[PDB]
């Protein structure tokens with residue numbers, strides 16, 4: 001994740 005894409 002909510003506060004963390006790959």
Ligand SMILES: [Cu+2]
Nearest residue numbers: 001002004005
């Ligand atoms: Cu994320």
